[PDB]
């Protein structure tokens, strides 16, 4: 249908139904997180709080995943076993990560039903991230005591970060257990995150795919690629803002320093991916908790193999966490080369021209001479355009599927990004 009928239907056909369904599918999780937030303010024994959040986590996992939730429950139990047998070793991170790796690999070799496994990637990913994080924090000395069974269980089944929620440190969960007052900034954060979650859901389902023919008079492979990319980006921002809202509702997600408590849990930064400066910023602002996790527990350990091999190991861990699909594996393998080549080329350029064109904004005290010139702005905007081009080329895979589908989707675009980064790399090596 043309733009006339499209906008004649739009509101009552997509904007209200999608929002009503999005609310009807998360209202119970929100009610449970609010019940936990109100119950953790009564001054209960800590073990009773941990048991209550274990019960709430069971209820939420059952509500979202009817009976397959065992494949999460079991995992948690297994994790605690691996945490109890080596509670004295300094290897806790290594043992827990190897256990998680073997578990996810056996799951992705169809030892579990291929549709039962695909449904619970989001819960198993968070449980695995939390277990490996606790195992490494105990080694590095950032967590003092190995937790008791109820503390570990209440950590893995934290009702705020169990279904959609981001990864949170063990101490960032203990601080949520001890409870903070129900301020008004808390309610403002919850409300703004819920409103932005619904807004991104609406823009992902309705405005996303129908952008260029209807919302723009523009219209074609690249336009379809870009609208698929933005629909994927906003479908991600929906889950990001919803996890932020459901973790700030349950009490977690805050930082306090010198008698000042601020609810500043940010999972995604949409303006750093829609108006990007470089692909490094895109990768690190797509998911901030996951970027911190992957940099702290996979990169800082695999860094012995060299910087590039460590980047490859980090992106392989990211592809394994997110579930091994061929389109996602190809995207996360192209992202390694893209971000590395762009970072090192911008590095050599900012060293040669002495301009502040580094893949991230330079701090106020830097050697670069030309900082706010218009040539620097032109170069930064050219690299932002290259980042948008890479984003479209990579997000064209998520049109709404193994090697054939990805090679087909990327062959229509003439493999443009994989030649652009090759050209950037040979340009890096020429000016070397």
């Amino acid at each position: 249908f043309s733009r006339q009928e499209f906008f004649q239907q739009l509101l009552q056909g997509c904007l209200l139904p999608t929002a009503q369904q999005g609310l009807d599918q998360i209202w119970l999780l929100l009610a449970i997180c609010l019940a936990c937030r109100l119950l953790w303010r009564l001054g209960l024994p800590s073990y009773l709080k941990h048991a209550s959040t274990v019960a709430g986590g069971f209820f939420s996992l059952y509500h979202f995943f009817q009976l397959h939730m065992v494949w999460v429950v079991l995992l948690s139990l297994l994790c605690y076993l691996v945490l109890f047998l080596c509670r004295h070793s300094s290897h806790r991170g290594v043992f827990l990560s190897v256990t998680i790796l073997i578990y996810l690999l056996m799951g992705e070799m169809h030892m579990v039903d291929t549709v039962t496994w695909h449904k619970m990637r989001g819960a198993q990913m968070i449980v695995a991230m939390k277990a490996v994080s606790l195992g490494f924090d105990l080694d590095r000395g950032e967590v003092g005591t190995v937790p008791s069974p109820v503390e570990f269980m209440g950590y893995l089944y934290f009702v705020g970060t169990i279904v959609f929620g981001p990864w949170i440190s063990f101490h960032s969960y203990l601080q949520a257990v001890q409870g903070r007052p129900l301020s008004c900034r808390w309610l403002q954060k919850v409300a703004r995150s819920l409103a932005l979650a619904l807004l991104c859901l609406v823009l992902s389902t309705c405005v996303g795919p129908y952008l260029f023919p209807y919302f723009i008079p523009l219209n074609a492979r690249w336009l379809r690629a870009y609208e698929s990319a933005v629909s994927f980006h906003f479908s991600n921002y929906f889950v990001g803002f919803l996890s932020e809202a459901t973790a700030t509702l349950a009490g977690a997600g805050f930082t306090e320093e010198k008698d000042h408590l601020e609810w500043d849990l940010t999972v995604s930064k949409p303006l750093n991916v829609e108006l990007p400066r470089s692909m490094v910023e895109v990768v690190t602002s797509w998911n901030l908790p996951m970027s911190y996790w992957l940099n702290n527990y996979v990169f800082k350990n695999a860094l012995r193999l060299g910087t590039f091999s460590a980047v490859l190991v980090t992106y392989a861990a990211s592809a394994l966490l997110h579930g091994f699909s061929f389109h996602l594996a190809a995207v996360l393998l192209s992202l390694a080369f893209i971000t590395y080549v762009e970072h090192v080329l911008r590095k050599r350029l900012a060293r040669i021209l002495s301009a502040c064109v580094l893949s991230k904004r330079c701090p106020p005290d830097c050697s670069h001479q030309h900082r706010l010139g218009l040539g620097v702005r032109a170069l930064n905007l050219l690299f932002g355009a290259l980042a948008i081009f890479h984003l479209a080329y990579l997000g064209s895979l998520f049109d709404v599927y193994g090697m054939a589908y990805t090679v087909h989707k990327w062959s229509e675009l003439s493999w443009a990004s994989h030649w652009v980064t090759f050209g950037c790399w040979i340009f890096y090596r020429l000016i070397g």
Partner: antibody
């Protein structure tokens, strides 16, 4: 019998650097963290940091960062700490302390290296 | 940084008496608090951890207690080998901070 044999007393001129050693005996050197503690004359203790001997990742106290650097030698089962740019305030007794394993309480301590910064 | 205040800074008592040391905590450490005893000219020695669990080999007259931000160590039937400095140290998470220290003297 666990024994953390620590180096002898050192006397360093200001602005220089010193290197204490703590040789481990009686357990697997790469099995437990090795915290470092500092105690002035008749004052409280202060946790400088620890080093994980399995993977050599360290964990510093931000009050002691840039001043103390931890290293290990697994062939000799020794843990070294290097203090840089010593001043008159760095004259204290420095202990090495093994973590208890499960918790990070300091179960086995050294005998202390008396560092004296003067003329 | 958590600030572990310890009281009193110095107390005196006879042999066979009963003494109590308190370690108030700036932030909230759940039950993670340890007690070390350092004699004159020696290295400290862990006595209590988890604020109540006596370590292996310590007489049963030392008793830890408390939780939250108010912990205490009680020594009843004071004996000659119980005089020294007592330091409370949280093991909640790095950086680990010790207390000021209570100098127990002979009366």
């Amino acid at each position: 019998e666990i024994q953390l044999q620590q180096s002898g007393a050192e006397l360093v001129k200001p602005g220089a650097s010193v290197k204490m050693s703590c040789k481990v005996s009686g357990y697997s050197f790469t099995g437990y963290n090795m915290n470092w503690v500092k105690q002035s004359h008749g004052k409280s203790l202060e946790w400088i940091g620890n080093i994980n001997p399995y993977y050599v990742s360290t964990n510093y106290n931000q009050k002691f960062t840039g001043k103390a650097t931890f290293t290990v030698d697994r062939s000799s089962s020794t843990a070294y700490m290097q203090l840089d740019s010593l001043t008159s305030e760095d004259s204290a007794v420095y202990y090495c302390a093994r973590s208890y394993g499960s918790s990070h309480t300091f179960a086995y301590w050294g005998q202390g290296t008396l560092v004296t910064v003067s003329s | 940084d958590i600030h572990m205040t310890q009281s009193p800074a110095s107390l005196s008592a006879f042999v066979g008496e009963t003494v109590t040391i308190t370690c108030r905590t700036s932030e909230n450490i759940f039950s993670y608090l340890a007690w070390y005893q350092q004699k004159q000219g020696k290295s400290p020695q862990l006595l209590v951890y988890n604020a109540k669990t006596l370590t292996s080999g310590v007489p049963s007259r030392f008793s830890g207690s408390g939780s939250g931000t108010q912990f205490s160590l009680k020594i009843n039937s004071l004996q000659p080998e119980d005089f020294g400095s007592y330091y409370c140290q949280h093991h909640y998470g790095s950086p680990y901070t010790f207390g000021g220290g209570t100098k127990l003297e002979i009366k």
